[PDB]
RNA sequence: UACCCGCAGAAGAAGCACCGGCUAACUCCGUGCCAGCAGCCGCGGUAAUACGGAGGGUGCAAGCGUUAAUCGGAAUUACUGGGCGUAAAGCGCACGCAGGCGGUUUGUUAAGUCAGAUGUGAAAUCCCCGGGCUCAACCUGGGAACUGCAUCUGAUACUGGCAAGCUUGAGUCUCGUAGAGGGGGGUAGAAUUCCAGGUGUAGCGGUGAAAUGCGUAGAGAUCUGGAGGAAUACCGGUGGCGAAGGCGGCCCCCUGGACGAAGACUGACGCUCAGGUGCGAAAGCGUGGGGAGCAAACAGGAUUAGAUACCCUGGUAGUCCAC
RNA sequence: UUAGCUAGUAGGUGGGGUAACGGCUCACCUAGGCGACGAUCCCUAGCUGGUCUGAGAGGAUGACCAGCCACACUGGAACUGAGACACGGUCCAGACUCCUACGGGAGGCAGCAGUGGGGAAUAUUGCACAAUGGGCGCAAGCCUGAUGCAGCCAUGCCGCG
């Protein structure tokens, strides 16, 4: 079903990052605001937005390059069927320190960069290339 | 390698892979053959070396290095098959036969074709007779008076009943013989009446049907008579290879028609739609049985229906 | 192809 | 003993394998699919750099080849890092326990995870910087590593547990609509065959052509009447329904799901499935009925070399129902 | 193509037992125990630090070095002693060989070599306690086939002519 919703997340930023959609609107939660908000702040997307509060609904901002897919592709990494953790030397980087990895902690959500001079390890979300 | 003595003697048997050969004084000795050998047939007088034996008395196999010249071949063909000569160097061959299953006449008439082209003497020979009623015996002895008057002898014969089993054989010392014939028509029976053979073995016999005849024996077996000569089995064959020659040799493949040809009407003649056949008016006179004749044309309209795509060697 | 398929019974060498 | 001095003179001290491609290196002669060669591809019956020999070369080296064994190459049991429409592979389908997994909001626990620290992970081996044996192998100093386990102190985003929820997930009610969904019980009319009667005469029947078979006791054909059996033309269509195999005359009775509209309502009640469980074309089997037509085996006639099959005339089991 | 296993078995009481807790043992009481997270049965195997292979993850393996367990012809038992159910201690049975005056006794190279035999295949029936370590003794000293060595085997690595 909706088991993994982070996956159903990445599932439709794709989709519309390649097809060429202008804006996309998917079920709003506490974990997919913390990890589109990293986002924002790494120039991947534009801006996000929320609407409603008994139907929680997020809203994404897509980004072009003349027309070209900015984020070219993302990967989930752990997932309800195996779980993902390494320590704070253990992390991987993505695209040999190009792209970014986040990385869930007890700090809250940040990437791997963020995570050298907060010194944790903990879940690896996904690999944004 | 490390082969023996070249010598001549006959080879018993064909196995594909080896052959059984036969030494100038009796020795049973299975050989493989050479590579460059395009044909290797039951009786066939060969040049051979027995190898060598790797433990002193006990040896396994030779070699078949040449074959001699043929005095003679029986070479019939098949479709998806070719030209496969079954036997060779022989100087008569035996038509053998059976009332049960069946008793046809065109399994005779296309044997009697292929043996004047060989110059070779067919010999009706028919068995499983004590079986009828002398009602019946004197229906089979009336249709067999027709291949007397043509020339060829006709002796009739049963195993079970060792009737005829010494005329037979008088007639048959010196040569080597093919008892030619169907599946199940008597052909081991025969060998076991007038041989005297080992009875160990003694042979295969499954011939039981319910309207048919099954062909148990294989291909060709050799041994000897007690006067002189051998004796060559036959398969049971059901196969007709007329690919040889044209219809010409048709007319030359029957003694009684030797001496009607030149006599009708045209240079070339049909002999069934043509008028004015001469043959046809000694079929219609009762000098020539019309059993035979409708039976020639049929023949003819067999290489109308085996030709139709086309076979050569 | 799932992991948890291997939890149960691993890839048998040949 | 290592070591060192002194002596004599290049004197005492190089071979094996390969040479078509892979794979470094080419000519000649002999041989004639024979002999042999070979790990693979495959070379040699009259010109073989592939066989044998010579000349020449190549790769190694006091070693050189071969055989056997293990891993690598092999992502060729694919966690890293494979596939399942047709190359090997998605159970015939459905229900469902255990197992795995799980929407969203808040609090709590700190289980999992993460941070730090302690103890421990024997030495040797491997790695880092050195030292030493004339060198190297080897020996050896310290450090690193040994990604391990245990305990304590922390952080709470995520996962787990507890607690309170929420509604978009999944369900419930009403109003409806469509349907060959299944089971049971009746019923209809053609057509087939059988039987009764009537009129009526030489063939009917069958095939490419014939024959078996049937018919002057009147067949066949037609008409009237009756019996039995099974299937439902047209409608009828990549049309509908059912989990699937499948399901089609009409009507009644019992009963299953699917879908649409308007709201109300419970509050994750869910997904999935090893064994287990049930359904499941037709043939066949057991018991007892039933019997038209079709039709294995089989009977008969053609066909044929033989016909066992094809073709034709008959015909049992079976096809029908209950279990 | 092993699904049920188990009656001293699971637990409790008391007695007994060992250096120590304990079905370790005995009488009684309870009917549990184990197990689809592989009980039980069958087959194979000393294990580990490691070595080899591989970019790594993995894979194969456990000779020499070191740690531990087990074994000392086969099976069983106890004594002695702080420590053994004891390689060169004993007792009993069995197997094999040797000695014998025929009644009886003797022996355990998986210790160093070495022979027979097996197998494709693996060494001298050598020297020394000079050093190290252990044993006895106040020490001296003695003993140590541990070890130190030497030889054989291009068996491997390295270096030179
Ligand atoms: N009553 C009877 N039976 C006979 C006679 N001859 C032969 N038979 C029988 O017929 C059968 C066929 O004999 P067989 O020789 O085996 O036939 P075949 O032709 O050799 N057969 P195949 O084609 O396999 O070689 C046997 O069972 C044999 O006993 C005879 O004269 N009378
Ligand atoms: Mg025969
Ligand atoms: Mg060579
Ligand atoms: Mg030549
Ligand atoms: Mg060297
Ligand atoms: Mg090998
Ligand atoms: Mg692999
Ligand atoms: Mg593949
Ligand atoms: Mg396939
Ligand atoms: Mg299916
Ligand atoms: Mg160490
Ligand atoms: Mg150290
Ligand atoms: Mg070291
Ligand atoms: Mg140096
Ligand atoms: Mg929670
Ligand atoms: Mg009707
Ligand atoms: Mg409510
Ligand atoms: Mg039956
Ligand atoms: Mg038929
Ligand atoms: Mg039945
Ligand atoms: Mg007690
Ligand atoms: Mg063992
Ligand atoms: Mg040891
Ligand atoms: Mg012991
Ligand atoms: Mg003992
Ligand atoms: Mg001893
Ligand atoms: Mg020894
Ligand atoms: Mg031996
Ligand atoms: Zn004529």
Same mark, same amino acid.
């Given at each position: ?129 | ?149 043509? *020339?060829?002898? &006709? ?8 009737? =005829? +089993?010494?005329? $037979? /054989? ?57 006067? *002189?000569?051998? &004796? ?8 007709? =290879? +007329?690919?040889? $020659? /044209? ?67 | ?14």
């Amino acid at each position: 079903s909706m088991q993994d919703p982070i996956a159903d997340m990445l599932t439709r930023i794709r989709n519309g990052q390649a097809a060429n959609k202008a804006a996309v609107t998917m079920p709003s939660s506490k974990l997919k605001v913390a990890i589109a908000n990293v986002l924002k702040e790494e120039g991947f997307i534009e801006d996000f937005k929320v609407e409603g509060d008994t139907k929680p609904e997020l809203e994404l901002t897509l980004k072009y390059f003349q027309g070209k897919a900015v984020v070219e592709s993302i990967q989930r990494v752990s997932r309800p069927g195996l779980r993902i953790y390494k320590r704070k030397d253990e992390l991987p980087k993505v695209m040999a320190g190009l792209g970014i990895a986040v990385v869930s902690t007890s700090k809250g959500v940040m990437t791997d960069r963020a995570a050298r001079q907060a010194g944790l390890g903990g879940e690896i979300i996904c690999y944004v290339a | 390698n490390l082969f023996g003595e070249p010598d001549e003697g006959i080879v018993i048997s064909r196995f594909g892979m080896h052959a059984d050969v036969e030494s100038a004084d009796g020795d049973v000795h299975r050989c493989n053959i050479r590579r460059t050998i395009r044909s290797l047939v039951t009786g066939d007088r060969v040049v051979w070396r027995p190898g060598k034996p790797a433990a002193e008395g006990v040896n396994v196999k030779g070699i078949v290095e040449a074959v001699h010249e043929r005095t003679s071949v029986l070479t019939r063909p098949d479709f998806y098959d070719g030209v496969k000569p079954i036997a060779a160097n022989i100087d008569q061959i035996v038509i053998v036969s059976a009332i049960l299953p069946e008793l046809s006449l065109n399994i005779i008439d296309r044997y009697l074709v292929a043996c004047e082209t060989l110059q070779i003497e067919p010999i009706i020979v028919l068995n499983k007779i004590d079986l009828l009623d002398d009602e019946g015996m004197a229906f089979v002895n009336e249709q067999m008076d027709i291949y007397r008057n043509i *020339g060829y002898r &006709v002796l009739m014969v049963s195993s079970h009943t060792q009737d =005829g +089993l010494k005329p $037979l /054989e008088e007639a048959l010392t010196g040569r080597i013989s093919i008892f030619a014939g169907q599946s199940g028509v008597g052909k081991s029976s025969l060998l076991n009446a007038l041989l005297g053979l080992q009875k160990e073995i003694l042979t295969n016999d499954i011939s039981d049907n319910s309207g048919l005849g099954q062909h148990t024996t294989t291909a060709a077996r050799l041994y000897h008579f007690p006067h *002189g000569g051998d &004796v060559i089995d036959s398969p049971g064959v059901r196969e007709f =290879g +007329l690919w040889h $020659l /044209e219809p010409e040799q048709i007319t030359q493949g029957f003694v009684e028609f030797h001496d009607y040809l030149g006599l009708c009407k045209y240079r070339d003649c049909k002999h069934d739609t043509d008028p004015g056949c001469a043959i046809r008016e000694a079929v219609e006179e009762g000098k020539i049985a019309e059993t035979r004749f409708e039976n020639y044309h049929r023949i003819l309209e067999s290489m109308a229906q085996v030709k139709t795509r086309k076979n050569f060697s | 192809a799932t992991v948890n398929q291997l939890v149960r019974k691993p890839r048998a060498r040949k």
